[model samples]
Target chain A: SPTGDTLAGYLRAQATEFLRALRLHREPVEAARALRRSARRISATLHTFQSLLDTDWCEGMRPELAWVSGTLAMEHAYTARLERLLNALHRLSGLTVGAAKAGALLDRQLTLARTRAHSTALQAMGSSRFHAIADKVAVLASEVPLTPAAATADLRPLATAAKDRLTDAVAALPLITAALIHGLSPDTVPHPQDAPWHQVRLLLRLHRYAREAVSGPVDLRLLSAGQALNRHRDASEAAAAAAQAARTPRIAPATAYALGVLHADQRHEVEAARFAFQQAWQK
Target chain B: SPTGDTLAGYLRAQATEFLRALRLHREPVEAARALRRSARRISATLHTFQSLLDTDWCEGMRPELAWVSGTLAMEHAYTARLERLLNALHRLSGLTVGAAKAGALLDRQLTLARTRAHSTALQAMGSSRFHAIADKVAVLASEVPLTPAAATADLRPLATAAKDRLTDAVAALPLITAALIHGLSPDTVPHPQDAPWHQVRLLLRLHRYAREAVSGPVDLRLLSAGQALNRHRDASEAAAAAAQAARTPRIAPATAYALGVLHADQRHEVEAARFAFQQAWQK
Candidate 1:
């Protein structure tokens, strides 16, 4: 059982890359994306092997990584939504004359949203708060064992921890009853619409993340189930977003009505995705 | 007491405009907006005057108006979001370099979202559903009441009904509890956020709509409180949206991380808005 030096080594390299990305805000798209991956890897390592490292230091750094990554992530999320909405508009253009004007209006709205988020990212990056986090990451690379007991920590224990997390998440999957399709209520009314499958999706994500960190093969069935739930989650969330957007105020009423229709359409897609997931899981 | 003929007349004109906008689907912004207002007026009249009007007819037509208004409203809601996000991004542009790429990505997504909504709107317009609704509206213009009682009903009762609704909403305002900052928990620990505030917003909206329909002067204080709450609701919702977008998958890890930051930023905004609402309400 080797000491957890390899994990620290990987974290150091990742932190270095993240800082570089932070400074070069000019082309932050790809760089920012890279920075987030590194941060997640570091954070995941810290979380998975907390007992093997300096717990206090890991705890402190975990939030900082979350902070930096969250700030950077805003721009990307805005970009993603912008892309999704545009693609949707483009597909609908042939369907109606108002589509072009509506497109113009939507484009104007999202472009501004992106700018605001980018500004926030920039502020976070330049703030003393960010500098403090960056300094801590630098310290983390050199100062590994916050406790003497952690100095001799081995690889097997960390692997076991990761396995335990994966197993727990997987185990919870069986409890996600078929009632997930009907709001997961205790009663058996069985409504055809609007379920809370998000909780299940979150569990699957945890399982996937734990498995990824362990660097070992997970059950094929679990892997497939997770993938199916991924589709279900995306569809469900997209529909939810559409519902929210449909409710936004001060738009031309006609346009709002159109959004309502779109919301219903996406909701149908959500239902379809849920049914598909249930089928896959059952089999 | 004047009869509700004026209300019904206005509704008929608005319904006509809505149908025309539905057909043209070209430069339907202004018309669509008008249609929604008209639909709202008619729906409100039906609701407020339910006791005076034929119950079954009011019920039938109310849902139809909602259906048309909802469909038309979607395009507008999407447009509003597009504008809002773009404006936010614009404000942030000076703060960062990546704002442009981020802006471009967001623009694309919204554009597509608009098109998809437009296509659905078009499909709905062409469907039998729209036709059936349109035919009903036309019939409503000439048909006075499903029952003789509505034909001879006084308008004073309807005004009183609207007033009662408004009063009820205002009365509930005190119950909104300042713990709204946490998660709006009912328990003693007061976790703060989510619940009741949304309910409060709905009540406020109902109040606003009722006041508008009644065409009477309202308490300036109540009016101001309502406006403040509107702002609070919008900010809260926008933040919620940003949080959701932050969780989108398959993006670069750095992008995802940046989104997390954005989510926190928005959550902060949400908290801030809740605080603001509390201040305004207390004052």
Candidate 2:
């Protein structure tokens, strides 16, 4: 529920920004750019939600939590482009009354965008450039001697925050916006089945971000909206430290992700196992 | 074979470019940028090839394609980031003798990338952004008011050319080199099973690009390879066109992806079929 609240809160925040952009008066291009950004922002919020859902509910899993944000942002982009295309067509459509030459040109741009969107998926899928970060992360982790247990402890709060958000943020949008939200009916839409599934699946995945964020022991501080939880965890730890008369050490965010992964991807049972395993293996 | 040849060629080219950058005494940052970009280029080629292989391979279908190139191109951004991250680690590792710190840091980055990649899959699925593109394309086509017969003839060549190049490229790659290709291992790499399959399906849809390009009635020139394909499709299209043309699109370079998905995800004929039907219907 916390995950849902956070995500919904994030979405509303994005929507508000978009709403602001629409109201802001500026040059057409400038305003368009702002609106375009707002569009992307809203789309990104939804995208993030989708990723979280997929991770929690589906077979998909991964480390790049932001990619759901990145990929869904494209919808904002394409829609913006479509909007521009529409505007351009309207402008051009009026010029040549009968044949509509400008409309033809407008159509061309739309086609190109559509075609590019379709054609790039496989290439996007295989591109290593995308995984450079992951590879680097792997390389970094390989060099570190952080006992999985210590890492798990540091990450626990973060994971909890992630779990909270993932548990709550994933929900269906209002049906009123379905036409615009879902795009076209499968029957009328080209490549209807695959495209829609991809969309649905993305939403499902977006909802998993919070879950993945905490699969391991996550430091609450790392979460974007975990101040309360972080304080709670930190306070709890401080009490333990005070009782033990020990100093509180700094923790890392990576632990949360690692735990989240173990929990969700590996389907590890019980949080204690992660901590115990880490303790057993600690340097 | 040109697709693979082109990708292998592109990777080699990028490697050479990096070599040149180093020779030119460019700053490590700049040089690394080149390396990262080259890596992405190589990755994109691999992605394109993989897309072809995993694509539905259905005849006469139009894929409501979206940025298969852009999505794959995303790797370039991470590669750039990784290059920087690795450089930092290299420096840090050099100063530090122990594997604990350096390895831990490197591993973190890898995990981060891994998590992000998985997250991206979930996001893409939930957003249903790809279907939106398909809808736009269908509408765009309708806006132009091209008859189905005309539409078929008009859009086929690019679609077919895409397929030919994709297949040919896959046919040409050596196993070892092909294995280096990005997104080649969706199962181990930590992405949703459907993500790769859908991406591949999208690329296969480019076969539709080639198909649509070669209209039976007239002016196939609009979609031919080189100038026309470039004019029509984007960078990925050019690559796909070259690969599909040769007919031998090698599995090692890309189609191996389909096998990987099938094996890793354990998707059956029915599931795979569903992917095919979905792509067509959604668009």
TM-score of each: 0.42, 0.17
Give candidate 1 regions above 4 Å deviation. A1-283, B6-10, B16-27, B90-105, B151-153, B173-195, B208-230, B264-283
For model 1, how big is the CA root-mean-square deviation? 22.4
Estimate, for each residue in B113-159, the C-alpha lDDT of model 2 and write its tens digit: 65676457335533566445424333322233222233223232334
Highest TM-score model number: 1
> Chain B of candidate 2 versus the native chain B: what TM-score?
0.23
Q: Model 1, residue A250: displacement in angstroms? A: 41
Model 2, residue B59: C-alpha shift (Å): 20
Give the lowest summed-lDDT range of ten residues in model 1 chain A: A176-185
Q: What lDDT does each candidate get?
A: 0.56, 0.32
Off by over 4 Å in 2: A1-283, B1-104, B107-283
